């Protein structure tokens, strides 16, 4: 039921026709520059955000470096180059330098989780947590415990070609 929101998408991203998938293109599309659009960081949000309750979705991930995904607070900064950090309201996993990371700050946390293909995200706004699990055995990857203070959106980022993220039906 989640779909990517094209009005938020950085113009270099290419969204799938069914709005489930995202990869990085080779040029910027000519798109209107709405306040909601990430104009520099290679990000896109889902069209649905959450202010309460518990929510699950699953994300199919490419094998090559370049992606990061999780959740963002609605007030995440959209304009100019911004850090990809929890302080900026991004709580995410990332594949970079051949390693899986939970994107903590100032140092990321390397995950010795083995190869990932699909990840379940469990967002719990009632207790204040977002957790990630590898779907094959639901092994726990990481949990951020956060007193979320605003609406929270699923977040996706792809900053190199050769990889992808896809919301799974």
């Amino acid at each position: 039921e989640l779909t990517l929101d094209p009005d938020t998408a950085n113009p270099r991203l290419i969204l799938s026709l069914d709005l489930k998938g995202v990869r990085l293109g080779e040029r910027a599309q000519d798109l209107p520059n709405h306040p909601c659009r990430f104009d520099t960081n290679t990000r896109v949000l889902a069209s649905c955000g959450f202010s309460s309750g518990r929510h699950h979705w699953e994300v199919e991930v490419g094998s090559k470096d370049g992606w990061a995904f999780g959740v963002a607070r609605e007030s995440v900064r959209r304009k100019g180059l911004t850090p990809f950090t929890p302080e900026e309201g991004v709580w995410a996993l990332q594949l970079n330098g051949g390693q899986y990371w939970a994107v903590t700050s100032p140092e990321r946390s390397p995950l010795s989780c083995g190869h990932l293909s699909r990840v379940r995200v469990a967002l719990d706004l009632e207790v204040g947590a977002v957790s990630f699990y590898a779907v094959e055995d639901m092994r726990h990857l990481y949990t951020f415990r956060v007193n979320f203070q605003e609406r929270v959106f699923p977040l996706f980022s792809v900053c190199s070609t050769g990889t992808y993220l896809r919301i799974w039906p």
Partner: peptide
């Protein structure tokens, strides 16, 4: 590295 600067 630098290649994730725009993440």
């Amino acid at each position: 590295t630098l290649e994730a600067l725009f993440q």
